[PDB]
Assembly symmetry: D3
């Protein structure tokens, strides 16, 4: 391996310059299988990586695990291997009453409720997605006619207190996050997830292109959801090769 | 008879306008409005000069913000009270990237928040991000006139001098926070400095208003008219797509 | 034409002046200048209108700053380049104390730094404090004409609306930082709100420049003024030449 | 399932109140194998879990994945299922010159270079280990005579820039972390890893007991990446049942 | 006269002492020293009163810190200059858990840093953590002496009043940061408030000095607004 | 005692509304000796208090101990007892080359390098002195005849790393304070001391008047250090000034 965690070499990529990066290792093969010539590359820790082909060009599918820290490892090591464009495809809880389960959300930028993004840029720097990538995702969502919402996502280092969940062991939420969901709602934030702030900040501050699309699995106020978002990211990738 | 404290405008003055182009300098307001139909002066108070015009049958506002986030936040809030829901910032700017030359145009996707006013709308974690539709329209408009365009991040500073790490000053000093900062933004891909976008983009993105920003490059510290006109044609053409 | 980037002034225009009175509104510049000897227009560019006059045979500058720290920081810097060493801000203001009434005059000893520009000169730990000689001159000028004067702390905000906890706005919301903030400043004895002094005082106190500030109360949140605050700033200038 | 991520029910725990939590899903089976009656429970995402028995009491082994965010999910859901004591067994990079690869490091408390700890307690709160757990770990290390060091650990949300690694795609480290390793070294910090700040903070602030131990796999005074602790964590567990 | 600026002590005065017991109150120094052999008064300047004594044949220093991190930081630094490498604070404290009784003994594993001086040694992310051997000696000493003992986190405040969310004050105002804070620390399991441990533990842990912290409960805040001394002496014996 | 630490009652004050607050308990008697009929009231921990009479009015002298935390206790408890005006008198090391030993420093406001101030007001709030107190101190300095500097003071929770001293056990200074003395120098900060940030902030944010004056007994930039009596003649000067200022504030 050329890299410490992923267990991949530059040759494994066969010239790939774009990676699709879901959180769940189990989702990796499902995405690769939608493209031509899917081949498993490696599986270490939460990092499962496959290669496939899109319109004749090699593409990587590599899981990030949950959270900015493992995401930052996958992105860095893929970048070392030659990836310059990253498309995250994830799941998300919506926090706006008008956003229905199964909807598709394209993230323009993220509220940085993580710690890893700070390891790349100070908080003043925007966790902003690449324009080409965001455009490709939006245009891909339109081509398949999905109900799409485009805007800001809150990206949290926790699933529970940072998304102001009280249904927990302690039932306590620290002061910083008490009342935070309503605040994000009033500010027009669409949804919560846990990787985009790190992904977008680390890419935008290092000359890498990143986009973020997600399928709505719950509304904080199903099957064809993932499929739709997954279709969208693969189609978007075609436009970015 | 004004409905707002600073702008000296009433809702009626807007004639149903829902979009405003917002340059910094009052002296540029008529010139922009003059590119559109039936331009008329509305008012002039402090750094807030407003004109109404018409674009493909729809009323549009052109209103200056003055220099800096504080004045901008006043113009934007009061225009919002008056019914504006879409704001397009037009400016001329320097650049901090060597590959960016005078004559190029910059469309800002999001800004580094080196201001104070943005914090009065959203905590620092919140992204000073432009509206997708506005950014799209600005890029496509730049495309239609064949402008050499750069799309990316802009550093938005409450100062012209130390926050842009200028040392040619009275004190010749730059506070620790900003010492070495220009090189840091350069390494992070930041295109340029200006002084209003962090405030504009943050206050709009966190209050359901659409904002975008375009600027012509007139200078570059690492290394004019046409550039300006281009930027202005771009912002007017973009406004047409957003009505 | 100009020794500075924005003001459109040369050192020659100042005729040796070392003190500037700095109102916010360009419209007020001529009025202040008119109270002194030999008043003449200098220049007008953006929100920076400048006049020169004379007191006791010494040149004095009057120059507007525009609204807010950013434009203030430009005016003060460029005036400092041209030789100004003492700055007296004159404003009108809204009081936050029940017993500070319209028509009262406020002299600011130091400001609560609710701005961004002050941080471009000194870290937050540094006091946005007025120069003692300036504050003395203003207080003594105020007493010499019998104004009802309050001396103390001013809250200096980058916004007119949320930073001063105004809810009569488009969104009707105030970010967490500022919710409940007016009552807090009130309990801490803060006199009033305005928008330029944190920047002015900090940038002067941290770079060997003298600054003071006086303001007329023309309204009170908890419920001819110009002429008096203006008379005070000119009489104070007389004492500082 | 009783919880959203782990795919476990309280019944799967068989009354277990202690969990050993490695970062790598592949280490779980190996840890479980050192105990009696090892049984696989589930594997979802980076969360692989096994049950075993120690001195006739059920014990859980469950991986956390890399980083605070996924750790916070595993700990929370284990807590919901009934776990009250958590022993992290990790790998680590030493930052002191005389720590040998293979050495066992027991963490008393962590430098919070993560984001997730802040979702449980403000930064002022110490990421401190439980005294009984730390004691059990030290005493267990003593009983097998491993080379052991006890002290403070820097816990980072990144593998690369937050641990001041420069052999990366960008080769740059953000201002906050430039010169940081030398600083921690001067302060006597022993090592870097990526989970303890979150684990220790979230446990200490919610009435859960946590201990932290790791084997050194690289010495950072010499290189950024490499070309006993497990026995100790199991023995320590015995003492805490 | 004195090898350090504030304490008025010389390296000679310590007679090779490498451990110091550091109470807050100068008036308690003589009392503690008296529990050991050959107690001799050394110096008394400002809030810094110091005695030397002997414990199982070895020199030991007792030196007051005064109230608060700043004065503590001076005493610890200057004692370190004179050769002290182990510091055991013995204090008084208000419990904030209902289950902790007055007269109970609290051993601190780490402190909530509600002080400013700790930041002069390490950034906020660094833990104000006690030395493991010192903490162990205190817990073991507490068994030996016999006392109801709790081991855990302590909130260390730069103020006695607003930082411990006391309202019995001139202004009756508690700043936003501290409004509701006691109940927050309570829910997070914090045992008690005092005013020196965050500075002490942070400055020691970040400078290769060993520090431990024990205190006797003199009030319980959920109700209103000699074991510890024997314990700190016994712990010192275990650390020489 | 009406208060938890000071061992004082309202009766002890005899209607006093002004307190002079040196840091060192040993200085309290010395300052009181500059006034009429001084009597010792109490001594507990670092808090030694005396009452004296100034132009026929009761005045308290009470030590604060070193640092914002003990200072906050003294000021708060004195406020409870009825004190409304506080004058700190210190001795200090200057950091400007032009500020000479023997000079007197009057502080208009302080750089908040302390923790206790934050327990009264967020960092944005200025650690600013009361105008009447500052005026009285400046005027008294002129009555006494001192060479006076008026301006900003850096108020640190430590004597060592926070004042960027490297002559210490570890010989290291945390990142925050590395290079900080040169920064404060460039910003015109006059000196370091350790109580004013807390004092000035807690008073300005609670309707209390506070001023600060100090005698310069050493300069961080100069090689030579005044003899056995670095303070004494200078100390005496600042003390005479704080008493003379108190006269104007009664
Ligand atoms: O509310 C949610 C729902 C889903 N997700 C999100 N928050 O975090 C993302 C994690 O990777 C993982 C955590 O369940 O899935 C994404
Ligand atoms: O330098 C290192 C070496 C090992 N580890 C550490 N940093 O982070 C821990 C991660 O879980 C994972 C990162 O590889 O293993 C632990
Ligand atoms: O609530 C309390 C009670 C006692 N103490 C504490 N807080 O601070 C410690 C101080 O040294 C001093 C404060 O009175 O005593 C310790
Ligand atoms: K993970
Ligand atoms: K302006
Ligand atoms: K003290």
């Amino acid at each position: 391996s050329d890299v410490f965690h992923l267990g991949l070499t530059k040759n494994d990529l066969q010239g790939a310059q774009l990676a699709i990066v879901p959180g769940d290792p189990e989702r990796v093969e499902k995405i690769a299988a939608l493209m031509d010539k899917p081949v498993k590359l490696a599986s270490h820790r939460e990092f499962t990586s496959w290669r496939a082909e899109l319109d004749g060009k090699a593409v990587i599918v590599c899981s990030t695990g949950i959270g900015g820290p493992s995401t930052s490892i996958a992105v860095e090591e893929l970048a070392q291997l030659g990836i310059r464009t990253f498309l995250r495809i994830g799941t998300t809880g919506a926090i706006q009453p008008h956003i229905n389960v199964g909807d598709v959300l394209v993230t323009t930028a993220s509220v940085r409720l993580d710690g890893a993004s700070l390891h790349f840029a100070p908080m003043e720097f925007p966790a902003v997605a690449d324009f080409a990538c965001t455009t490709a995702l939006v245009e891909a969502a339109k081509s398949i006619g999905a109900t799409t919402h485009v805007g800001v996502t809150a990206s949290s280092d926790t699933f529970y207190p940072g998304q102001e969940r009280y249904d927990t062991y302690s039932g306590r939420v620290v002061r910083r996050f008490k009342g935070s969901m309503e605040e994000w709602q009033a500010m027009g934030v669409m949804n919560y997830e846990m990787e985009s702030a790190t992904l977008l900040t680390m890419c935008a501050s290092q000359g890498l292109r990143a986009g973020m699309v997600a399928g709505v699995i719950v509304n904080r106020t199903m099957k064809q959801t993932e499929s739709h978002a997954v279709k969208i990211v693969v189609e978007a990738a075609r436009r970015l090769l």
